[PDB]
Design a protein around this nucleic acid. Sequence first.
DNA 1: CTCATAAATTGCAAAATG
RNA 2: CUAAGAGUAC
DNA 3: CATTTTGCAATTAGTACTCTTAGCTATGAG
Lengths: 69, 48, 10, 45, 56, 1176, 159, 56
Amino acid sequence: MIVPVRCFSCGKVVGDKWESYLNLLQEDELDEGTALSRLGLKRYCCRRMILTHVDLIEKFLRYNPLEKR
Amino acid sequence: NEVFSRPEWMILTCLPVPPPPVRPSGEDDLTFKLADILKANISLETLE
Amino acid sequence: TXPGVTXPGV
Amino acid sequence: TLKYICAECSSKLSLSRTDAVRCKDCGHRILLKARTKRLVQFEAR
Amino acid sequence: SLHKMSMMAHRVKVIPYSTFRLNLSVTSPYNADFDGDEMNLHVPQSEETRAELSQL
Amino acid sequence: FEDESAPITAEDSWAVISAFFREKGLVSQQLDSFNQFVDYTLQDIICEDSTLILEQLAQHTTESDNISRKYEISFGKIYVTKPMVNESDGVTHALYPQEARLRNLTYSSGLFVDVKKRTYEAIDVPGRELKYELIAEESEGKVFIGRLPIMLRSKNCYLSEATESDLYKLKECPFDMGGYFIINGSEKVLIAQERSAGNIVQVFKKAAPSPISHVAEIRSALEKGSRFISTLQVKLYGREGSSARTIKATLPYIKQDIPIVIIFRALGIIPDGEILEHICYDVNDWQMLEMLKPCVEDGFVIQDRETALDFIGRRGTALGIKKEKRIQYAKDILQKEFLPHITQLEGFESRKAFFLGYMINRLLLCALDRKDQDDRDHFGKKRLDLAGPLLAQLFKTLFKKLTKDIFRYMQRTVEEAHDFNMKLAINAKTITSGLKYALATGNWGERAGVSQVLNRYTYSSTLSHLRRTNTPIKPRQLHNTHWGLVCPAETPEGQACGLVKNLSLMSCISVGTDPMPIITFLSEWGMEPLEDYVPHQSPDATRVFVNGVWHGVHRNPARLMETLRTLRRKGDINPEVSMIRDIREKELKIFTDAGRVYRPLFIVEDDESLGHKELKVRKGHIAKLMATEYQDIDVEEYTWSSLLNEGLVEYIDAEEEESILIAMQPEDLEPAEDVDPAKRIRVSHHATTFTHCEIHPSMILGVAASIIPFPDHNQSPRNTYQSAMGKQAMGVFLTNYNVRMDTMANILYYPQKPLGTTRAMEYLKFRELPAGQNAIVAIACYSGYNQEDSMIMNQSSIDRGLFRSLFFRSYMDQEKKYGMSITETFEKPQRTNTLRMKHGTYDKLDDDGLIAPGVRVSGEDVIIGKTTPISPDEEELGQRTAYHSKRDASTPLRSTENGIVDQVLVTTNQDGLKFVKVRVRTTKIPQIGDKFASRHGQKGTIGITYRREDMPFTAEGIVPDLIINPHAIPSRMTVAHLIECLLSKVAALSGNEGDASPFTDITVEGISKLLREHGYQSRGFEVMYNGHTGKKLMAQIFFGPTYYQRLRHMVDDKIHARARGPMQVLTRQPVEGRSRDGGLRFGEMERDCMIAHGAASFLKERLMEASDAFRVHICGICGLMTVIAKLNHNQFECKGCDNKIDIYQIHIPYAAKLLFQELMAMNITPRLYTDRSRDF
Amino acid sequence: NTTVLADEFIAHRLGLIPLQSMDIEQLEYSRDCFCEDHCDKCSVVLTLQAFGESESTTNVYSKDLVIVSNLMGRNIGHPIIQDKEGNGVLICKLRKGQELKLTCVAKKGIAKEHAKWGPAAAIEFEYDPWNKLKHTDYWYEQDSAKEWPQSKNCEYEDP
Amino acid sequence: RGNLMGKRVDFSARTVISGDPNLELDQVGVPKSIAKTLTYPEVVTPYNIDRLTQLV
DNA sequence: CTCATAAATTGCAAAATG
RNA sequence: CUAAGAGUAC
DNA sequence: CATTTTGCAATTAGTACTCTTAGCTATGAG
Ligand SMILES: [Mg+2]
Ligand SMILES: [Zn+2]
Ligand SMILES: [Zn+2]
Ligand SMILES: [Zn+2]
Ligand SMILES: [Zn+2]
């Protein structure tokens, strides 16, 4: 849905490393592993936390809001 | 048996009617069947 | 018989 | 009266008991009740 | 409950969670795993049934 | 690449698959069948018959009015509109699916038909033939005959041409695939019903005791006719030891099994030689002639066609025809009831005689041990009725009903000479209600379970449901013909095992085409007409069958098959048409009807340039497909239809799949002939005669089994368990779940795409809508709390958001008009003037009777306040006055459940009465008892939860999210679980994604080497430390990420206890089910176990005190319960016996009292006596 | 809350936000405090107020969390920022016109009561890298020394 | 067979089962809710007046 | 305008004859 | 409330 | 005195959960 704040196993705060990850993947044309290493995710728990996340919220944000002010 | 079951009692002439406890109520299916039986009995009686 | 338990017979 | 929202317009309306449920702006027939004003408590866990 | 051993008198130990808890050995007579199995609990309502349940 | 015509690799074929799924989609069969039904089959149903003629004779007492009239009603073209809804105010407007679902409407489009009322008159002169002429009143005028429900995304649906932005605008999920109906706001899907194919001759060996040894039958049916089934059977009486073997046929509407020779002479074939030629094709085949001699020796009594027809008419069961006209009647039986699929006209007696001879030939070939009996389970012998044919036959019956009603009304109004009107004639309610009922309830009539509530628990669950096939009832066995058409391992574990199947990923169902063009092609290309076919002069002739109708013979079937293949490969013939050439039997079979299940395959040609067999698809077509896909993600577009049009790919069904050879993979089977020991052993088959190529073997799996990582590294029952268990997996079923008011929804907080992912799961949008999470699993006998499939879930991992979920539940409530002015009203019931107010608190309702979103609700709390008017001015119960004119009809929350009210939706139903849907959202956090399972059938509950410190930890401080017992691995042999854990570890470390497709060249050795390159033990073991003492574990623990699903089976929805509560009204026993606070069953064998334990008093307590103890009175004179008791007055009296002191009371179950009462009501006296009249 | 995320979903995300706790010993547990629900001596009140006034998605981070209660000079309450961009944890996203107003009471807590209070993350712990104490029996196929990679700590002890 | 040989009974519970190596063979773990629902009638006796009074 | 009716077990008594 | 049906757990 | 022959339906693992639909349709007459 949206990037989890903390890695489930260890607890490293990885909710602030999603937009940086996407910018690395897009602007710097880095592959996934090098970007994960760059962000500081050395344990494969955090690496699977950030690597396999699916950003469903974009989909949810396409629909017009039910309550619009 | 002389007392409990004679052969002539195998032919029905007075049908027992179970109470509504047996057929609680829209009505139960036994209620409708008894209604149909009574309707047929009244039809035959009037024709006679 | 019946069926079940034709007839008899048939 | 109590507030509702058009399912399409997202417009807010106030409806009484005798009012027929429609959106005054667009005429859609689906309305959703508004969020309550009383505070709600969530445990952040 | 294919046999008498699949229905046995146990002693209640109250626990603070939402599942029946039984020893691993006593699963063999019941043919019970823990992959979603459900089990039934009957409580006697008299001293006589309680007593013969505990003693037989 | 550089070479345009170079051969493709195994990776290239995926591009092809992509192109396929760009054009078809996952539910293409549903939409295709419904589009066929709307576009062509409705008009066929309307035009066939439906011309009501009523010929009112003159009935002229005097010659003044000697005029005979004839009123005829004809139905012309049928117009189907876009879906629209009526209203209480009568305003009709366009209806969208995410309005029908919310308003409990039906996404139905009105049907109209052009009615032409003609009237003819004739002069009624006796003797002179009547000549009817028009009166120039040729009035014609569309009329509304009902509403056809429209399946979503179909060609007549508003979402057919919607783009992604348009779908988002209309509150429609782009991931939603359609192919289902909306009936009363519920998504209903039509399960593909499996049946035996029509117009196919099947021969079966019978048992020894039966006098018939072999039975040859056809379930004949014509599609463009009455669609009535006549089961012609040809049976071979007499066993092998019997010398009198007479073959007898079972004609419809015939009381006896007429011998075949009688039928042959009746059709017009008198001489014995002609009959035997029509049945047997070889003069040297003296065995068949010897077996057939009893038939001709039996029929020698008849030597004339009129004699045989008279014999049949004598055996005719109508018994209402004179002797001279029996012939004619027999003709009718032999023209319109005998093999309708051939023809319904006259002058084709030779064709039906040929078909009868062919059936007898098949029966003899099966009886002469020259061929095996037909397999009943062969999937090419089965047809799947999709939404198309099912709705077609249902609408056929329903429109027959409507037109019969029209004729009855016309006859009534012409006999009574009242005015005639079209509106007063047509009853649109007939068609509308019939369709709506047959779709709302599974029963398909006026079969069961044809229409089912669409499963929306998970996206893969929805897909598998939309591609589900049901077989009415050794059909349970996975047949060989199921290869690539249904999933090899996807079927329920229970009584439905094998009967319920799921389609393969690329498998499609034909929709049916008109077979006239193929007949024209055959006739042009030299098909010898069947009328002048003399087998003696053309012995080595190949018989051509079209849809089971033997149409002729050909002398050069090779060229005919080649040109038919070319025409199908160039698009001239619809590719769904299946063509089969059985060389040994010398038969050619063409099938074009609907229901056939086929799959696509690459085409392999001789390719003289390379000198060896090669795929017809090369790198140029792959490059064009890649270019088209990239353009979608300027060049000429290249889609799957382009491959189908230039002969690049083909559609082959199980009928054609019998006469082909398929290469499993191109890179290893096409080219003509130090190896890696870690790779699995494969064979070359030492043969080069391939005709087609599998696009990919991983396409044999279904939607649910395409999620399994390394399914070829698992025991097959585990794959079946995972296929049936991923439909229970929890994920995101649709992206627009926030705007759907479904009954139950469960959503993962953080669905993660698998680290070990398959190539076939990015066509299922699994990576877009994942249904599980990657949990760090350790396989260890850690604490003994994970024994016997229990698991130890990391409590600290749960706290941080693992498998946490949202749960939405919606309560629907309408106001119904009890009368003209007895309308219900949603309101807050007041204790002053309301009756039967539930014990739950009403304090959470405001004036309009609905809880505003945000307010917490607990168990039994009222969320919907509804009251209905009643008759006032009654006094009883102590506090009932005339003021209590409102009876409570509220709907409280579930007793066990609770949560935050998400939303409430108010709208107007079809009648215009306001109704509401209250959706309540709560959080399901995993706890001790929830069921979790890997993608390999490793189901299990949470035995216990340990915090992070207590879990074993590696040298890097990583603690597992899950601990599973080692003992689940050896017995269950889920090696794929281990391999996917290793692959997920490698993928998470290296940042790539694990390619866990089934039949790839991925080895455990390669994964281990990659893991060793990353600084870890190659086999996934990690030195771990005990969390209680920190000491190293003497054994190293298998450790790594693994994909787990949270299943719908939580302990919170299964715990259930009942000391006392509501009882059953009939038997005075506890009610059934936890939803009613019911009582648990103390079944028969539980009683038997308590008997074996010897505890009699406990058994009596179970069956009397705990369930039903009823004190009933009897008398010692007659043991019946006819004792009137007045307990307060202390008077017992059995009428008839004239006794008042000879009474006893007994304690028997109320069920026993009711049984005795039903026995007495059925003239049986169970007299109960309290003393022994006999010794033991 | 007019967003697409559930209320308790956002509450869950907020609970996982790390907060500065340098002087947490100066705070008191709310359970053994004399106030009714929460006071200044035992809690920190934050308020997240966001609006979707931009035509593109607007990201509600943890940097927008503003402390309401007067911290009385302590060094608690502040969300911890680590990245170079300066925006904290991505709490939520807003389409145009969406609004999200909420308030948070923050107590002191240990990782036992809930893992969201865990300040520890992963703690590497190792002893005797050369297995001289024989506290492990190394699983192996051909040779335990070769198949088991030497730890980085093996350089700090004599083989 | 549906109401006499086997019938639905009160004073019974049913739920999921989990293993517990720290329970005796004859012991069964009972959830606190199920214990709070299923009940036993204990006759008031001079020997159990105090504890049943405290339970009341 | 609204209520009333259209697999595998079993368990044989005939009917015919020479 | 009853009945029918469908899916599902072991 | 000795065979002999024939036609088919009812009853057949336990519990346990959830949800969906429907309850004589249309026509006459007071
Ligand atoms: Mg089990
Ligand atoms: Zn981590
Ligand atoms: Zn509006
Ligand atoms: Zn008496
Ligand atoms: Zn305080």
